Design a protein around this ligand. Structure first.
Ligand code: MG
Ligand code: ZN
Ligand code: ZN
Lengths: 67, 1339
């Protein structure tokens, strides 16, 4: 249900580059550049951007190609 | 962007470029109208206008041409912020020298002019005449001259002699100083002179002139002809109520230097004589002195003010020492504070927030939702809606606050856990609610404490508070792996009462199907909370990762123990619940749950424990009554028996049998023995007080008393505090340091007397006075440790080194204190681990040791494994992540970018607020005796006496590891039992520390050689034939003839042949020290190893802070320099010099020691440079330059841990060794060849210069270095950036040194970027600096 930023940090195992991919991803949702693949959970843009990292729908090369 | 800031002297051509005009009139405002005029301090012609886009006449006020200039006057139109950048300058008639080059102790002008500090001042004040450009004249430039002396010099010379006096005479020499030729005079005369005070002066001349030319600075830039003025916006005139205004203290200093400059600018054509032309220049020189700095030399005063004028030097420093007021504190927006309040109905990842605070902190966020929805198009209409607090505003306020985390922190912060982000939930009230479990990390109680609040704004900050600063992420402590979210006192008490077992209870012997069926019977009232039942459980084992199996098992537990298993997830077994569940039992439960299941299930498990702990505690009637403090019936028997024994002791004091010096020791030892006798009888009655009856005869169980529950569970209280309520208090301590002979008999329940209560005040007031001082010392200790560990950021991922430190368990003492598994937990391996058998490997490479490898190494007999320490990994600019251990907060490895230097300094200063015989060897265990570093020869009798001072007795267990290692003194008689089992308590040594044993390895007849009667030996015996021996004489009490004579009892064979010991050609001889008693006379046979002669023999914060400053103690231990032969110096010379002569290479150099300290006066023994000679405190300076770097790091961690383990805290060894790496960065050079002789260079800077110079044809361009240990105060100032050295202390000396050197600053540190405004290079800011250097490196 809610965002799980604890287990998502264990997949990449960096906890420092995860917020870098989440910053450029959450900025595209607020400006309206791209539509999120996962359905909206009636939350802010900073929450949906963290759930897409653990699901594997977005990545460093995926977010770079969308811009 | 911008970087590479420079510091240099200003040129006269550059000052005229920043200025926009010239000021010559002190008048700046008018009394008729408060508007500035032309040519003033607040004028609009040079600086900007008083308002935006306005002028003096007021003709042009439009916004079409902002850059246009007015034609009626000189003031142009501009903005209001332009008055902060524009500045002016004054034109001086005579140049004046600054005070920065004369205020510091080494005068920068005198070192370049070969003059003193007083002589350079006598010339500027027109007090003495000097000559310049002599040429063909006998007068020198450095020599002085008077009025009559200069006139006589012109008569004998006639020409080629110009004597000038004033500031122009000094400036005329700097233009023709010939800096290129002045360095050649000192370099050519470098090998000619041989002196200590002249060599140090020569090093400072070459190191400063080289940096003076390499920076592009000019010598004439020291003295300035013009003086820039500060912009008027930094010294404004703000009016207040009543028609009054305020003027800064700087406006008076600028007014004093301007009017005196005009008085000198108008006296250039009036033909002023010499009497006044020398004094009017000093009026201007003292004005610049009062403008730069006050209190040192000038100390200017003003009217109606006792304090001196605030000059430009005192405004940048301010208060709090050398640190600026802006750096120590900066006000921020979107903040607030209130009183805390505990809330049990709050989740762990959220907190509380009042509606009145959420409406003011999130004010800009509400205006963004009202305009986007379409309710208020104008921002003014939305402001009136949020103030009226209508029903629609509360709808959007709860919508904007749903997942936006806020920050919470207490006023004092000592560690990283002080700032934790929380999710705000709207509540009703005026207090900020907090979770009860996170109070252990904040170190705050609900007694009136106020916590701060902060609101992040940007999108980058919202993602930061949800990944690292969240409350669910920082569960483990930064010091040790134990969690800090452990259940607190109240919830543990509720859990301890649940996990209990009663002998007779309601609903015993019944069988339940499952946990759901067992809980149904408890709520119905047919089953007690703690009763022996038989239930069936369903648990899952996670021995294999990725697979979960289920199995049913029927166990014999209680009803309360079965309900607790419903809280723990199915991933854990059942054996972690069947215990008594004390406070230490749950601390090991969360630590085990964190490393088995994960983190997503640990937060839910830690939250469900607080709900089930409080629900089952409110149903309990745990209350402290007067009947709970039971008194044992044996208290009156011990007190009446002890009172009758003291009456027997005091009666003997009046007769004269016992003295007062021994009566004090017997009374404090009698009441102390009676103090433990009451405590043993009190706890034995409180533990078995409850007596239950079942099936006839009664039985005994654990007492369910309210006071015993709070002590057995460990939730609140200690074992020593019970002795003060239901038992006697005992002896108390006086403020002077002594102990009162009579103790306090009564306790708190029976009531204290008027005199007994006055004694307890001495220890209470001293305790309340210490908690007010530790807040200042611990806060000062954490500031010095963090200022030396800021530039240490993990940036590398693979170093490639093969060095490390040997790790061994705490084998010192009777038993083990710290096991091996608790020391290498998380530290990677350095080399290959070898089995007891050869050709075997356990760990192949440097793999990270986890909880799985700890049990794998504990099953084997391995005990000495080498790991990689931060003192190793000599790479520059950070520390690699491989040699660094695992993360303390995260279970995985340390990532790239985490600042391990800050978390290491905070882990030491965090527990600072809590911190304030040897005759025989008796082993406590049994095993094979193994001797190491002990050389003992065989004995003819069989006692195996060893006279060596280096040795240790270690007993090995059945596995092969040394369980206990004791210290063996010199001259100890011990029987070896290698290969035989030893019983517990068996005596292994029977040495005597009262007399120093002296033995000789030579076996034969001994004869004294070089002994004179009446000078060195005295025939003195005891009374009644008590002792008939030969007593030697002292070195100072002997005569002048026997002062240089030293007795030497040589041992040879009985047949007449000279016997010598193997190894050295010098025959073995017996030592004869001063005041020695030899029982065996000369000419008699003596056994090998027998006694030759008879010679009789703080703590706290100041202790832990002494080890980091490398402070030498008052009494330093005396050691040996080079191993070899040990001897005794001449007593007649007054300095005992122990000469050395090794067998490999003879060293004629030796050291001398004074006769004030007497230690190791034995003539003839081994050197043992590693072994100490004089017993006492050891200095860390002598250990580094003698043995190496591995022992100094092992000694610091050992002594520091012995201070923290006394109180009970546990700190990991990674934080103690991290500070040791920064203190060992400076090294000294002996024979450089490529640089100066004595200089301070870094170890990494010398290693890169050594490796690059070795790649040549000569292969000898490199040099040698030596490691030196520096304190934390001296290592902080040894930095390349002047910003880090200016913010620490003494910003005056560091600001002048950077001016004459011209250093270019590279912003690559932590403290350097917080003052400029850029991102820090540590943490998430490393990715920003990686793209900056990549773009800069491309060109
Ligand atoms: Mg408090
Ligand atoms: Zn005008
Ligand atoms: Zn390393």
């Amino acid at each position: 249900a809610r965002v799980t930023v604890e287990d998502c940090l264990d997949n990449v195992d960096n906890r420092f580059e995860l917020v870098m991919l989440a910053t450029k991803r959450a900025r595209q949702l607020a400006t309206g550049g791209k539509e999120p693949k996962v359905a909206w959970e009636n939350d802010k843009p900073t929450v949906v951007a963290l759930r897409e990292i653990a699901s594997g729908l977005v990545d460093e090369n995926v977010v770079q190609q969308e811009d | 962007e911008f970087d590479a800031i420079r510091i240099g002297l200003a040129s006269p051509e550059m000052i005229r470029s920043w200025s926009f005009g010239e000021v010559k009139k002190p008048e700046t405002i008018n009394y008729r109208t408060f508007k500035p005029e032309r040519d003033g301090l607040f004028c609009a012609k040079i600086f900007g206008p008083v308002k935006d886009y306005e002028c003096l006449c007021g003709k042009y006020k439009r916004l079409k041409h902002r850059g246009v200039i007015c034609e009626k006057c000189g003031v142009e139109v501009a903005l209001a912020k332009v008055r902060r950048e524009r500045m002016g300058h004054i034109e001086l008639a005579s140049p004046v020298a600054h005070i920065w080059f004369l205020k510091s102790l080494p005068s920068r002008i005198g070192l370049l002019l070969d003059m003193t500090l007083r002589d350079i001042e006598r010339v500027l004040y027109f007090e003495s005449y000097v000559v310049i450009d002599p040429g063909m004249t006998t007068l020198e430039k450095g020599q002085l001259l008077n009025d009559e002396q200069y006139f006589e010099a012109l008569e004998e010379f006639g020409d080629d002699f110009d004597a000038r006096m004033g500031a122009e005479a000094v400036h005329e020499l700097l233009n023709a100083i010939d800096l290129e030729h002045e360095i050649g005079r000192l370099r050519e005369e470098i090998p000619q002179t041989n002196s200590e005070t002249k060599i140090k002066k020569l090093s400072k001349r070459l190191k400063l002139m080289e940096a003076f030319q390499g920076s592009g600075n000019k010598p004439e830039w020291m003295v300035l002809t013009v003086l820039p003025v500060l912009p008027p916006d930094l010294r404004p005139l703000v009016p207040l109520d009543g028609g009054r205004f305020a003027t800064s203290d700087l406006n008076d200093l600028y007014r004093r230097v301007i009017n005196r400059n005009n008085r000198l600018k108008r006296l250039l054509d009036l033909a002023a004589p010499d009497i006044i032309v020398r004094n009017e220049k000093r009026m201007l020189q003292e004005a610049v002195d009062a403008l730069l700095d006050n209190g040192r030399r000038g100390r200017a005063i003003t009217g109606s003010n006792k304090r001196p004028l605030k000059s430009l030097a005192d405004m940048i420093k301010g208060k709090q020492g050398r640190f600026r007021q802006n750096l120590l504190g900066k006000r921020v927006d979107y903040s607030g504070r209130s009183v805390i309040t505990v809330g049990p109905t709050l989740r762990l990842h959220q907190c509380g927030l009042p509606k009145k605070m959420a409406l003011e902190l999130f004010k800009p966020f509400i205006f963004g939702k009202l305009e986007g929805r379409g309710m208020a198009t104008t921002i003014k209409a939305a402001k009136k809606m949020v103030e009226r607090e209508l029903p629609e505003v509360w709808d959007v306020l709860a919508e904007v606050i749903r997942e936006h985390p806020v920050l919470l922190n207490r006023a004092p912060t000592l560690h990283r856990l002080g700032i934790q982000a929380f999710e705000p939930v709207l509540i009703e009230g005026k207090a900020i609610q907090l979770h009860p479990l996170v109070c252990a990390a904040y170190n705050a109680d609900f007694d009136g404490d106020q916590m701060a609040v902060h609101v992040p704004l940007t999108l980058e900050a919202q993602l930061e508070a949800r990944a690292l600063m969240m409350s669910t992420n920082n569960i483990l402590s930064p010091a040790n792996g134990e969690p800090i979210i452990v259940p607190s006192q109240d919830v543990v008490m509720g859990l301890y009462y649940m996990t209990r077992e009663a002998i007779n209870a309601k609903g015993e012997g019944m069988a339940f199907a499952d946990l759901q069926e067992v809980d149904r019977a408890y709520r119905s009232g047919q089953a007690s909370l703690h009763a022996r039942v038989k239930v069936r459980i369903n648990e899952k084992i996670k021995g294999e990762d990725g697979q979960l199996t289920a199995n049913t098992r029927i166990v014999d537990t209680t009803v309360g123990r079965a309900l607790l298993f419903q809280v723990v997830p199915a991933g854990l077994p059942f054996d972690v619940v069947n215990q008594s569940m004390k406070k230490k039992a749950i601390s090991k439960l969360i630590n085990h749950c964190y490393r088995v299941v994960g983190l997503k299930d640990t937060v839910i498990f830690a939250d469900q424990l607080m709900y089930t702990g409080f629900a089952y505690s409110t149903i309990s009637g745990v209350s402290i009554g007067v009947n709970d403090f039971v008194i044992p019936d044996e208290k009156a028997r011990i007190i009446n028996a002890a009172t009758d024994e003291v009456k027997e002791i005091e009666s003997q004091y009046a007769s004269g049998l016992v003295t007062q010096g021994e009566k004090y020791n017997k009374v404090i030892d009698l009441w102390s023995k009676a103090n433990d006798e009451v405590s043993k009888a009190m706890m034995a009655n409180l533990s078995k007080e409850k007596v239950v009856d079942r099936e006839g005869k009664e039985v005994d169980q654990e007492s369910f008393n309210s006071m015993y529950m709070m002590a057995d569970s460990g939730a609140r209280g200690s074992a020593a505090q019970i002795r003060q309520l239901a038992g006697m208090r005992g002896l108390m301590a006086k403020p002077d340091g002594s102990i009162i002979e009579t103790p306090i008999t009564a306790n708190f329940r029976e009531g204290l007397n008027v005199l007994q209560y006055f004694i307890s005040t001495h220890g209470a007031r001293k305790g309340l006075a210490d908690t007010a001082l530790k807040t200042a010392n611990s806060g000062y200790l954490t500031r010095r440790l963090v200022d030396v560990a800021q530039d240490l950021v993990v940036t590398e991922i693979d170093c490639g080194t093969e060095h490390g430190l040997l790790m061994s368990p705490h084998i010192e003492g009777g038993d083990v204190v710290e096991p091996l598994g608790e020391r290498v937990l998380g530290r990677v391996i350095a080399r290959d681990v070898f089995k007891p058998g050869s050709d075997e490997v356990i760990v192949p490479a440097g793999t990270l040791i986890d909880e799985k490898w700890v049990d794998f190494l504990e099953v084997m007999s391995v005990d000495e494994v080498v790991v990689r320490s931060p003192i190793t990994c000599e790479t520059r600019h950070g520390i690699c992540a491989m040699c660094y251990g695992r993360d303390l907060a995260r279970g995985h490895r340390v990532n790239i970018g985490e600042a391990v230097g800050v978390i290491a300094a905070q882990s030491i200063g965090e527990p600072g607020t809590q911190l304030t015989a040897a005759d025989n060897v008796q082993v406590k265990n049994g095993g094979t005796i193994r001797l190491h570093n002990l050389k003992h020869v065989v004995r003819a009798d069989g006692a195996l006496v060893a006279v060596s001072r280096s040795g240790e007795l270690a007993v090995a267990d059945d596995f092969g590891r040394e369980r206990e290692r004791y210290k063996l003194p010199y001259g100890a008689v011990i029987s070896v039992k290698e290969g035989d089992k030893v019983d517990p308590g068996a005596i292994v040594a029977k040495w005597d520390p009262h007399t120093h044993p002296i033995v000789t390895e030579v076996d034969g007849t001994v004869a004294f050689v070089g002994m004179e009667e009446g000078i060195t030996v005295k025939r003195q015996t005891d009374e009644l034939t008590g002792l008939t021996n030969i007593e030697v004489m002292d070195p100072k009490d002997r005569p002048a003839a026997g002062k240089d004579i030293r007795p030497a009892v040589k041992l040879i064979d009985a047949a007449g042949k000279d016997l010598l010991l193997p190894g050295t050609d010098v025959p073995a001889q017996y030592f004869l020290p001063a005041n020695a008693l030899v029982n065996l006379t000369d000419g008699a046979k003596v056994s090998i190893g027998d006694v030759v002669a008879r010679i009789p023999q703080t703590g706290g914060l100041p202790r832990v802070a002494d080890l980091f400053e490398a402070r030498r103690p008052k009494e330093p231990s005396i050691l040996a320099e080079i191993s070899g032969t040990i001897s005794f110096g001449k007593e007649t010379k007054g300095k005992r010099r122990l000469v050395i002569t090794p067998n490999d290479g003879s060293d004629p150099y030796e050291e001398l020691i004074p006769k004030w300290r007497h230690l190791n006066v034995f003539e003839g023994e081994q050197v043992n440079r590693g072994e100490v000679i004089s017993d006492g405190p050891s200095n860390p300076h002598d250990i580094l330059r003698l043995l190496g770097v591995s022992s100094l790091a092992k000694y610091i961690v050992n002594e520091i841990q012995d201070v923290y383990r006394l109180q009970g805290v546990k700190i990991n060894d990674k934080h103690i060794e991290t500070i040791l790496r920064q203190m060992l960065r400076k090294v000294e050079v002996s024979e450089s060849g490529d640089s100066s002789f004595i200089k301070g260079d870094q170890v990494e800077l010398t290693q890169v210069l050594e490796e690059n110079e070795q790649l040549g044809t000569e292969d000898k361009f490199p040099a040698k270095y030596e490691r030196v240990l520096l304190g934390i105060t001296k290592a902080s100032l040894s930095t390349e950036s002047f910003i880090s050295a200016a913010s620490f202390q003494e910003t005056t000396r560091v600001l002048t040194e950077a001016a004459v050197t011209g250093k270019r600053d590279f912003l690559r540190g932590l403290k350097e970027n917080v003052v400029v405004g850029r991102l820090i290079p540590a943490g998430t800011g490393l990715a920003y600096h990686s793209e900056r250097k990549r773009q800069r490196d491309l060109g």
